[PDB]
Amino acid sequence: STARPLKSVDYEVFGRVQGVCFRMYAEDEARKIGVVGWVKNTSKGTVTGQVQGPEEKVNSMKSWLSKVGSPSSRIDRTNFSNEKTISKLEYSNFSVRY
């Protein structure tokens, strides 16, 4: 629950007509930040998903993703909405497309 400063936040990258190569970049750097979760691949490139991490690490993660470095394309606009503090890291790292 909320009493634990472990925040499950949802993101959305506005990849209008796909192209957004968020993969690997996410995984590797999110690991380094100290965060867990996943990527959700839609039809029309709205790269959404879940970021769970301890408070300070999710802050860093938010500073990132807007900090847009590339393995191919531009991560075209990342909004951070749906913020809910939970308990424990309920996933095997920040992973792949689901």
PDB file of all heavy atoms in Angstrom, residues 8-13 22 36-42 46-52 61 65 79-84 91 94 96-98:
ATOM      1  N   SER A   8       4.134   2.842  -8.432  1.00  0.00           N
ATOM      2  CA  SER A   8       3.697   2.365  -9.747  1.00  0.00           C
ATOM      3  C   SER A   8       2.964   3.455 -10.533  1.00  0.00           C
ATOM      4  O   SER A   8       1.937   3.994 -10.122  1.00  0.00           O
ATOM      5  CB  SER A   8       2.904   1.051  -9.735  1.00  0.00           C
ATOM      6  OG  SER A   8       1.960   1.019  -8.657  1.00  0.00           O
ATOM      7  N   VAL A   9       3.752   3.942 -11.489  1.00  0.00           N
ATOM      8  CA  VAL A   9       3.445   5.022 -12.429  1.00  0.00           C
ATOM      9  C   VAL A   9       3.282   4.406 -13.823  1.00  0.00           C
ATOM     10  O   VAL A   9       3.963   3.446 -14.202  1.00  0.00           O
ATOM     11  CB  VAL A   9       4.589   6.034 -12.423  1.00  0.00           C
ATOM     12  CG1 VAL A   9       4.410   7.177 -13.430  1.00  0.00           C
ATOM     13  CG2 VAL A   9       4.806   6.649 -11.036  1.00  0.00           C
ATOM     14  N   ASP A  10       2.339   4.977 -14.565  1.00  0.00           N
ATOM     15  CA  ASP A  10       2.126   4.666 -15.984  1.00  0.00           C
ATOM     16  C   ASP A  10       2.558   5.829 -16.869  1.00  0.00           C
ATOM     17  O   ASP A  10       2.476   7.007 -16.511  1.00  0.00           O
ATOM     18  CB  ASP A  10       0.658   4.305 -16.246  1.00  0.00           C
ATOM     19  CG  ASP A  10       0.277   2.977 -15.580  1.00  0.00           C
ATOM     20  OD1 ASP A  10       0.447   1.938 -16.254  1.00  0.00           O
ATOM     21  OD2 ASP A  10      -0.223   3.036 -14.434  1.00  0.00           O
ATOM     22  N   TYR A  11       3.144   5.438 -18.000  1.00  0.00           N
ATOM     23  CA  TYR A  11       3.616   6.371 -19.033  1.00  0.00           C
ATOM     24  C   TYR A  11       2.924   6.116 -20.369  1.00  0.00           C
ATOM     25  O   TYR A  11       2.232   5.118 -20.554  1.00  0.00           O
ATOM     26  CB  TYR A  11       5.139   6.281 -19.157  1.00  0.00           C
ATOM     27  CG  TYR A  11       5.664   4.963 -19.731  1.00  0.00           C
ATOM     28  CD1 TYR A  11       5.925   4.889 -21.090  1.00  0.00           C
ATOM     29  CD2 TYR A  11       5.868   3.879 -18.872  1.00  0.00           C
ATOM     30  CE1 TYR A  11       6.397   3.686 -21.618  1.00  0.00           C
ATOM     31  CE2 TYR A  11       6.333   2.688 -19.396  1.00  0.00           C
ATOM     32  CZ  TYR A  11       6.587   2.605 -20.762  1.00  0.00           C
ATOM     33  OH  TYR A  11       7.073   1.450 -21.284  1.00  0.00           O
ATOM     34  N   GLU A  12       2.968   7.153 -21.207  1.00  0.00           N
ATOM     35  CA  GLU A  12       2.594   7.066 -22.628  1.00  0.00           C
ATOM     36  C   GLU A  12       3.464   7.971 -23.505  1.00  0.00           C
ATOM     37  O   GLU A  12       3.554   9.178 -23.309  1.00  0.00           O
ATOM     38  CB  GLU A  12       1.115   7.374 -22.826  1.00  0.00           C
ATOM     39  CG  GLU A  12       0.646   6.941 -24.214  1.00  0.00           C
ATOM     40  CD  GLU A  12      -0.875   7.004 -24.367  1.00  0.00           C
ATOM     41  OE1 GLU A  12      -1.369   8.091 -24.725  1.00  0.00           O
ATOM     42  OE2 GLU A  12      -1.505   5.944 -24.168  1.00  0.00           O
ATOM     43  N   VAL A  13       4.191   7.280 -24.387  1.00  0.00           N
ATOM     44  CA  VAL A  13       4.971   7.843 -25.494  1.00  0.00           C
ATOM     45  C   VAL A  13       4.034   7.918 -26.712  1.00  0.00           C
ATOM     46  O   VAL A  13       3.563   6.900 -27.226  1.00  0.00           O
ATOM     47  CB  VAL A  13       6.196   7.003 -25.847  1.00  0.00           C
ATOM     48  CG1 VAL A  13       7.059   7.705 -26.902  1.00  0.00           C
ATOM     49  CG2 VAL A  13       7.068   6.696 -24.629  1.00  0.00           C
ATOM     50  N   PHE A  22      11.724   2.271 -28.462  1.00  0.00           N
ATOM     51  CA  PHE A  22      11.868   2.455 -27.011  1.00  0.00           C
ATOM     52  C   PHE A  22      12.573   1.294 -26.329  1.00  0.00           C
ATOM     53  O   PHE A  22      13.253   1.462 -25.312  1.00  0.00           O
ATOM     54  CB  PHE A  22      10.440   2.650 -26.490  1.00  0.00           C
ATOM     55  CG  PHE A  22      10.363   3.153 -25.039  1.00  0.00           C
ATOM     56  CD1 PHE A  22      10.536   4.511 -24.777  1.00  0.00           C
ATOM     57  CD2 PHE A  22       9.965   2.276 -24.043  1.00  0.00           C
ATOM     58  CE1 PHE A  22      10.290   4.997 -23.497  1.00  0.00           C
ATOM     59  CE2 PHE A  22       9.717   2.751 -22.762  1.00  0.00           C
ATOM     60  CZ  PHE A  22       9.876   4.112 -22.504  1.00  0.00           C
ATOM     61  N   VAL A  36      11.645  -1.349 -12.189  1.00  0.00           N
ATOM     62  CA  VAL A  36      10.922  -2.548 -12.620  1.00  0.00           C
ATOM     63  C   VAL A  36       9.642  -2.135 -13.357  1.00  0.00           C
ATOM     64  O   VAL A  36       9.143  -1.019 -13.195  1.00  0.00           O
ATOM     65  CB  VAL A  36      10.684  -3.318 -11.318  1.00  0.00           C
ATOM     66  CG1 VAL A  36       9.508  -4.291 -11.293  1.00  0.00           C
ATOM     67  CG2 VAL A  36      11.953  -4.030 -10.854  1.00  0.00           C
ATOM     68  N   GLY A  37       9.154  -3.026 -14.220  1.00  0.00           N
ATOM     69  CA  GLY A  37       7.906  -2.845 -14.975  1.00  0.00           C
ATOM     70  C   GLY A  37       8.010  -3.422 -16.388  1.00  0.00           C
ATOM     71  O   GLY A  37       8.733  -4.382 -16.630  1.00  0.00           O
ATOM     72  N   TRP A  38       7.348  -2.732 -17.324  1.00  0.00           N
ATOM     73  CA  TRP A  38       7.199  -3.188 -18.717  1.00  0.00           C
ATOM     74  C   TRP A  38       6.708  -2.126 -19.705  1.00  0.00           C
ATOM     75  O   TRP A  38       6.267  -1.031 -19.349  1.00  0.00           O
ATOM     76  CB  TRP A  38       6.308  -4.427 -18.806  1.00  0.00           C
ATOM     77  CG  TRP A  38       4.922  -4.295 -18.162  1.00  0.00           C
ATOM     78  CD1 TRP A  38       4.678  -4.606 -16.890  1.00  0.00           C
ATOM     79  CD2 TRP A  38       3.701  -4.091 -18.794  1.00  0.00           C
ATOM     80  NE1 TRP A  38       3.360  -4.623 -16.692  1.00  0.00           N
ATOM     81  CE2 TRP A  38       2.723  -4.317 -17.822  1.00  0.00           C
ATOM     82  CE3 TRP A  38       3.335  -3.816 -20.098  1.00  0.00           C
ATOM     83  CZ2 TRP A  38       1.375  -4.244 -18.128  1.00  0.00           C
ATOM     84  CZ3 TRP A  38       1.980  -3.753 -20.412  1.00  0.00           C
ATOM     85  CH2 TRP A  38       1.006  -3.958 -19.441  1.00  0.00           C
ATOM     86  N   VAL A  39       6.832  -2.516 -20.971  1.00  0.00           N
ATOM     87  CA  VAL A  39       6.405  -1.763 -22.159  1.00  0.00           C
ATOM     88  C   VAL A  39       5.163  -2.441 -22.745  1.00  0.00           C
ATOM     89  O   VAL A  39       5.076  -3.673 -22.819  1.00  0.00           O
ATOM     90  CB  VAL A  39       7.550  -1.746 -23.165  1.00  0.00           C
ATOM     91  CG1 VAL A  39       7.188  -1.096 -24.508  1.00  0.00           C
ATOM     92  CG2 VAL A  39       8.818  -1.066 -22.639  1.00  0.00           C
ATOM     93  N   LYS A  40       4.193  -1.619 -23.117  1.00  0.00           N
ATOM     94  CA  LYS A  40       2.961  -2.009 -23.819  1.00  0.00           C
ATOM     95  C   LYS A  40       2.950  -1.370 -25.219  1.00  0.00           C
ATOM     96  O   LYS A  40       2.911  -0.147 -25.385  1.00  0.00           O
ATOM     97  CB  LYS A  40       1.733  -1.572 -23.018  1.00  0.00           C
ATOM     98  CG  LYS A  40       0.404  -2.090 -23.594  1.00  0.00           C
ATOM     99  CD  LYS A  40      -0.754  -1.641 -22.693  1.00  0.00           C
ATOM    100  CE  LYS A  40      -2.127  -1.867 -23.320  1.00  0.00           C
ATOM    101  NZ  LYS A  40      -2.460  -3.306 -23.396  1.00  0.00           N
ATOM    102  N   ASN A  41       3.022  -2.273 -26.186  1.00  0.00           N
ATOM    103  CA  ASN A  41       3.000  -1.960 -27.620  1.00  0.00           C
ATOM    104  C   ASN A  41       1.562  -2.045 -28.147  1.00  0.00           C
ATOM    105  O   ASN A  41       0.869  -3.045 -28.001  1.00  0.00           O
ATOM    106  CB  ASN A  41       3.903  -2.914 -28.395  1.00  0.00           C
ATOM    107  CG  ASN A  41       3.522  -4.392 -28.251  1.00  0.00           C
ATOM    108  OD1 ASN A  41       3.509  -4.973 -27.166  1.00  0.00           O
ATOM    109  ND2 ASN A  41       3.173  -5.038 -29.361  1.00  0.00           N
ATOM    110  N   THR A  42       1.106  -0.902 -28.648  1.00  0.00           N
ATOM    111  CA  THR A  42      -0.227  -0.788 -29.256  1.00  0.00           C
ATOM    112  C   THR A  42      -0.113  -0.874 -30.786  1.00  0.00           C
ATOM    113  O   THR A  42       0.969  -0.872 -31.358  1.00  0.00           O
ATOM    114  CB  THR A  42      -0.850   0.567 -28.911  1.00  0.00           C
ATOM    115  OG1 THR A  42      -0.043   1.568 -29.543  1.00  0.00           O
ATOM    116  CG2 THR A  42      -1.020   0.794 -27.412  1.00  0.00           C
ATOM    117  N   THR A  46       1.639   4.228 -29.575  1.00  0.00           N
ATOM    118  CA  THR A  46       1.484   4.692 -28.186  1.00  0.00           C
ATOM    119  C   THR A  46       2.072   3.683 -27.191  1.00  0.00           C
ATOM    120  O   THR A  46       1.422   2.765 -26.710  1.00  0.00           O
ATOM    121  CB  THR A  46       0.011   4.976 -27.863  1.00  0.00           C
ATOM    122  OG1 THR A  46      -0.791   3.930 -28.391  1.00  0.00           O
ATOM    123  CG2 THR A  46      -0.435   6.340 -28.392  1.00  0.00           C
ATOM    124  N   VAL A  47       3.385   3.833 -27.037  1.00  0.00           N
ATOM    125  CA  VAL A  47       4.220   3.014 -26.157  1.00  0.00           C
ATOM    126  C   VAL A  47       3.987   3.436 -24.704  1.00  0.00           C
ATOM    127  O   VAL A  47       4.366   4.509 -24.251  1.00  0.00           O
ATOM    128  CB  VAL A  47       5.685   3.031 -26.596  1.00  0.00           C
ATOM    129  CG1 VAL A  47       6.633   2.370 -25.599  1.00  0.00           C
ATOM    130  CG2 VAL A  47       5.842   2.314 -27.942  1.00  0.00           C
ATOM    131  N   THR A  48       3.058   2.668 -24.153  1.00  0.00           N
ATOM    132  CA  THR A  48       2.585   2.765 -22.768  1.00  0.00           C
ATOM    133  C   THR A  48       3.214   1.647 -21.927  1.00  0.00           C
ATOM    134  O   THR A  48       4.165   1.009 -22.370  1.00  0.00           O
ATOM    135  CB  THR A  48       1.053   2.840 -22.756  1.00  0.00           C
ATOM    136  OG1 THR A  48       0.545   2.910 -21.421  1.00  0.00           O
ATOM    137  CG2 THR A  48       0.330   1.763 -23.568  1.00  0.00           C
ATOM    138  N   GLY A  49       2.732   1.461 -20.712  1.00  0.00           N
ATOM    139  CA  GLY A  49       3.220   0.460 -19.754  1.00  0.00           C
ATOM    140  C   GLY A  49       3.384   1.006 -18.330  1.00  0.00           C
ATOM    141  O   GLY A  49       3.071   2.164 -18.040  1.00  0.00           O
ATOM    142  N   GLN A  50       4.132   0.208 -17.572  1.00  0.00           N
ATOM    143  CA  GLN A  50       4.255   0.335 -16.114  1.00  0.00           C
ATOM    144  C   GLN A  50       5.705   0.496 -15.658  1.00  0.00           C
ATOM    145  O   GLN A  50       6.600  -0.215 -16.130  1.00  0.00           O
ATOM    146  CB  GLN A  50       3.651  -0.898 -15.446  1.00  0.00           C
ATOM    147  CG  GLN A  50       2.125  -0.878 -15.485  1.00  0.00           C
ATOM    148  CD  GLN A  50       1.440  -2.182 -15.097  1.00  0.00           C
ATOM    149  OE1 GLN A  50       1.979  -3.111 -14.493  1.00  0.00           O
ATOM    150  NE2 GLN A  50       0.180  -2.315 -15.496  1.00  0.00           N
ATOM    151  N   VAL A  51       5.897   1.505 -14.807  1.00  0.00           N
ATOM    152  CA  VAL A  51       7.139   1.812 -14.092  1.00  0.00           C
ATOM    153  C   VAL A  51       6.833   1.740 -12.591  1.00  0.00           C
ATOM    154  O   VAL A  51       6.104   2.565 -12.055  1.00  0.00           O
ATOM    155  CB  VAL A  51       7.682   3.198 -14.433  1.00  0.00           C
ATOM    156  CG1 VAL A  51       9.018   3.475 -13.748  1.00  0.00           C
ATOM    157  CG2 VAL A  51       7.878   3.404 -15.935  1.00  0.00           C
ATOM    158  N   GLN A  52       7.366   0.691 -11.968  1.00  0.00           N
ATOM    159  CA  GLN A  52       7.390   0.501 -10.518  1.00  0.00           C
ATOM    160  C   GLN A  52       8.848   0.608 -10.068  1.00  0.00           C
ATOM    161  O   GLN A  52       9.733  -0.044 -10.624  1.00  0.00           O
ATOM    162  CB  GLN A  52       6.858  -0.872 -10.102  1.00  0.00           C
ATOM    163  CG  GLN A  52       6.041  -0.877  -8.808  1.00  0.00           C
ATOM    164  CD  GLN A  52       6.636  -0.181  -7.591  1.00  0.00           C
ATOM    165  OE1 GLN A  52       6.749   1.037  -7.486  1.00  0.00           O
ATOM    166  NE2 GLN A  52       6.895  -0.895  -6.490  1.00  0.00           N
ATOM    167  N   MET A  61      13.722   8.196 -13.267  1.00  0.00           N
ATOM    168  CA  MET A  61      13.007   7.619 -14.411  1.00  0.00           C
ATOM    169  C   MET A  61      12.103   8.622 -15.153  1.00  0.00           C
ATOM    170  O   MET A  61      12.012   8.562 -16.374  1.00  0.00           O
ATOM    171  CB  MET A  61      12.197   6.439 -13.879  1.00  0.00           C
ATOM    172  CG  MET A  61      12.375   5.166 -14.695  1.00  0.00           C
ATOM    173  SD  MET A  61      11.434   5.171 -16.268  1.00  0.00           S
ATOM    174  CE  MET A  61      11.540   3.462 -16.724  1.00  0.00           C
ATOM    175  N   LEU A  65      13.188   9.332 -19.917  1.00  0.00           N
ATOM    176  CA  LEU A  65      12.095   9.065 -20.860  1.00  0.00           C
ATOM    177  C   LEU A  65      11.639  10.272 -21.678  1.00  0.00           C
ATOM    178  O   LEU A  65      11.070  10.120 -22.755  1.00  0.00           O
ATOM    179  CB  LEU A  65      10.867   8.389 -20.255  1.00  0.00           C
ATOM    180  CG  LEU A  65      11.128   7.084 -19.495  1.00  0.00           C
ATOM    181  CD1 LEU A  65       9.792   6.491 -19.054  1.00  0.00           C
ATOM    182  CD2 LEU A  65      11.891   6.053 -20.323  1.00  0.00           C
ATOM    183  N   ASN A  79       4.517  11.405 -21.700  1.00  0.00           N
ATOM    184  CA  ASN A  79       3.662  11.917 -20.619  1.00  0.00           C
ATOM    185  C   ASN A  79       3.586  10.871 -19.501  1.00  0.00           C
ATOM    186  O   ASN A  79       3.418   9.675 -19.757  1.00  0.00           O
ATOM    187  CB  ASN A  79       2.277  12.206 -21.202  1.00  0.00           C
ATOM    188  CG  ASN A  79       1.304  12.779 -20.168  1.00  0.00           C
ATOM    189  OD1 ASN A  79       0.630  12.063 -19.435  1.00  0.00           O
ATOM    190  ND2 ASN A  79       1.259  14.100 -20.052  1.00  0.00           N
ATOM    191  N   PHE A  80       3.618  11.391 -18.281  1.00  0.00           N
ATOM    192  CA  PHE A  80       3.603  10.584 -17.046  1.00  0.00           C
ATOM    193  C   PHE A  80       2.323  10.877 -16.259  1.00  0.00           C
ATOM    194  O   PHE A  80       2.173  11.939 -15.663  1.00  0.00           O
ATOM    195  CB  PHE A  80       4.839  10.900 -16.202  1.00  0.00           C
ATOM    196  CG  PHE A  80       6.166  10.743 -16.940  1.00  0.00           C
ATOM    197  CD1 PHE A  80       6.786  11.868 -17.474  1.00  0.00           C
ATOM    198  CD2 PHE A  80       6.768   9.488 -17.028  1.00  0.00           C
ATOM    199  CE1 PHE A  80       8.019  11.746 -18.101  1.00  0.00           C
ATOM    200  CE2 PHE A  80       8.001   9.366 -17.656  1.00  0.00           C
ATOM    201  CZ  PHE A  80       8.613  10.493 -18.185  1.00  0.00           C
ATOM    202  N   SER A  81       1.359   9.974 -16.426  1.00  0.00           N
ATOM    203  CA  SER A  81       0.054  10.051 -15.762  1.00  0.00           C
ATOM    204  C   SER A  81      -0.371   8.672 -15.257  1.00  0.00           C
ATOM    205  O   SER A  81      -0.098   7.665 -15.906  1.00  0.00           O
ATOM    206  CB  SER A  81      -1.047  10.656 -16.633  1.00  0.00           C
ATOM    207  OG  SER A  81      -1.384   9.785 -17.715  1.00  0.00           O
ATOM    208  N   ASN A  82      -1.254   8.695 -14.257  1.00  0.00           N
ATOM    209  CA  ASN A  82      -1.600   7.555 -13.395  1.00  0.00           C
ATOM    210  C   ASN A  82      -0.431   7.193 -12.480  1.00  0.00           C
ATOM    211  O   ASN A  82       0.547   6.563 -12.879  1.00  0.00           O
ATOM    212  CB  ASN A  82      -2.082   6.322 -14.153  1.00  0.00           C
ATOM    213  CG  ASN A  82      -3.392   6.587 -14.904  1.00  0.00           C
ATOM    214  OD1 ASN A  82      -4.491   6.433 -14.365  1.00  0.00           O
ATOM    215  ND2 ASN A  82      -3.307   7.074 -16.136  1.00  0.00           N
ATOM    216  N   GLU A  83      -0.464   7.835 -11.320  1.00  0.00           N
ATOM    217  CA  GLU A  83       0.548   7.686 -10.250  1.00  0.00           C
ATOM    218  C   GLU A  83      -0.090   7.136  -8.980  1.00  0.00           C
ATOM    219  O   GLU A  83      -0.975   7.759  -8.392  1.00  0.00           O
ATOM    220  CB  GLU A  83       1.191   9.037  -9.939  1.00  0.00           C
ATOM    221  CG  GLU A  83       2.212   9.536 -10.966  1.00  0.00           C
ATOM    222  CD  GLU A  83       1.594   9.909 -12.320  1.00  0.00           C
ATOM    223  OE1 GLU A  83       0.669  10.752 -12.328  1.00  0.00           O
ATOM    224  OE2 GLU A  83       2.042   9.308 -13.318  1.00  0.00           O
ATOM    225  N   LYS A  84       0.289   5.896  -8.659  1.00  0.00           N
ATOM    226  CA  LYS A  84      -0.214   5.149  -7.507  1.00  0.00           C
ATOM    227  C   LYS A  84       0.872   4.377  -6.740  1.00  0.00           C
ATOM    228  O   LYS A  84       1.510   3.459  -7.254  1.00  0.00           O
ATOM    229  CB  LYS A  84      -1.378   4.232  -7.898  1.00  0.00           C
ATOM    230  CG  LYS A  84      -1.115   3.358  -9.139  1.00  0.00           C
ATOM    231  CD  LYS A  84      -2.330   2.495  -9.476  1.00  0.00           C
ATOM    232  CE  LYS A  84      -2.189   1.840 -10.856  1.00  0.00           C
ATOM    233  NZ  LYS A  84      -2.300   2.855 -11.919  1.00  0.00           N
ATOM    234  N   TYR A  91       7.523  -7.409 -10.639  1.00  0.00           N
ATOM    235  CA  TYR A  91       7.978  -7.796 -11.983  1.00  0.00           C
ATOM    236  C   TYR A  91       9.489  -8.032 -12.027  1.00  0.00           C
ATOM    237  O   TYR A  91      10.259  -7.426 -11.276  1.00  0.00           O
ATOM    238  CB  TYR A  91       7.649  -6.750 -13.050  1.00  0.00           C
ATOM    239  CG  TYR A  91       6.168  -6.611 -13.371  1.00  0.00           C
ATOM    240  CD1 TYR A  91       5.466  -5.528 -12.871  1.00  0.00           C
ATOM    241  CD2 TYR A  91       5.567  -7.579 -14.176  1.00  0.00           C
ATOM    242  CE1 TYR A  91       4.106  -5.402 -13.178  1.00  0.00           C
ATOM    243  CE2 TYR A  91       4.220  -7.455 -14.480  1.00  0.00           C
ATOM    244  CZ  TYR A  91       3.515  -6.362 -13.989  1.00  0.00           C
ATOM    245  OH  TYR A  91       2.259  -6.142 -14.440  1.00  0.00           O
ATOM    246  N   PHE A  94      12.473  -3.966 -15.467  1.00  0.00           N
ATOM    247  CA  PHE A  94      11.835  -3.281 -16.588  1.00  0.00           C
ATOM    248  C   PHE A  94      12.229  -3.981 -17.893  1.00  0.00           C
ATOM    249  O   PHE A  94      13.400  -4.077 -18.268  1.00  0.00           O
ATOM    250  CB  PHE A  94      12.196  -1.791 -16.606  1.00  0.00           C
ATOM    251  CG  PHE A  94      11.224  -0.975 -17.457  1.00  0.00           C
ATOM    252  CD1 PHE A  94      10.146  -0.343 -16.842  1.00  0.00           C
ATOM    253  CD2 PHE A  94      11.399  -0.902 -18.840  1.00  0.00           C
ATOM    254  CE1 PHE A  94       9.227   0.355 -17.614  1.00  0.00           C
ATOM    255  CE2 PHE A  94      10.480  -0.204 -19.612  1.00  0.00           C
ATOM    256  CZ  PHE A  94       9.398   0.409 -18.996  1.00  0.00           C
ATOM    257  N   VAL A  96      10.139  -6.052 -21.592  1.00  0.00           N
ATOM    258  CA  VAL A  96       9.871  -6.008 -23.043  1.00  0.00           C
ATOM    259  C   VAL A  96       8.444  -5.552 -23.353  1.00  0.00           C
ATOM    260  O   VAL A  96       7.723  -5.078 -22.475  1.00  0.00           O
ATOM    261  CB  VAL A  96      10.185  -7.368 -23.664  1.00  0.00           C
ATOM    262  CG1 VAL A  96      11.687  -7.678 -23.592  1.00  0.00           C
ATOM    263  CG2 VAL A  96       9.380  -8.537 -23.088  1.00  0.00           C
ATOM    264  N   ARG A  97       8.073  -5.673 -24.630  1.00  0.00           N
ATOM    265  CA  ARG A  97       6.709  -5.392 -25.110  1.00  0.00           C
ATOM    266  C   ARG A  97       5.704  -6.505 -24.787  1.00  0.00           C
ATOM    267  O   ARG A  97       5.985  -7.690 -24.934  1.00  0.00           O
ATOM    268  CB  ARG A  97       6.701  -5.065 -26.608  1.00  0.00           C
ATOM    269  CG  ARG A  97       7.128  -6.238 -27.498  1.00  0.00           C
ATOM    270  CD  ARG A  97       6.789  -5.956 -28.965  1.00  0.00           C
ATOM    271  NE  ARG A  97       7.279  -7.077 -29.785  1.00  0.00           N
ATOM    272  CZ  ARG A  97       7.889  -6.965 -30.971  1.00  0.00           C
ATOM    273  NH1 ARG A  97       8.078  -5.791 -31.585  1.00  0.00           N
ATOM    274  NH2 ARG A  97       8.437  -8.052 -31.535  1.00  0.00           N
ATOM    275  N   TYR A  98       4.636  -6.057 -24.141  1.00  0.00           N
ATOM    276  CA  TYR A  98       3.477  -6.881 -23.752  1.00  0.00           C
ATOM    277  C   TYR A  98       2.208  -6.397 -24.457  1.00  0.00           C
ATOM    278  O   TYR A  98       1.444  -7.263 -24.927  1.00  0.00           O
ATOM    279  CB  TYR A  98       3.242  -6.823 -22.238  1.00  0.00           C
ATOM    280  CG  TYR A  98       4.312  -7.388 -21.291  1.00  0.00           C
ATOM    281  CD1 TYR A  98       5.646  -7.423 -21.649  1.00  0.00           C
ATOM    282  CD2 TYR A  98       3.907  -7.666 -19.986  1.00  0.00           C
ATOM    283  CE1 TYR A  98       6.614  -7.702 -20.688  1.00  0.00           C
ATOM    284  CE2 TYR A  98       4.867  -7.943 -19.020  1.00  0.00           C
ATOM    285  CZ  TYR A  98       6.208  -7.939 -19.381  1.00  0.00           C
ATOM    286  OH  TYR A  98       7.162  -8.011 -18.424  1.00  0.00           O
TER     287      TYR A  98
END
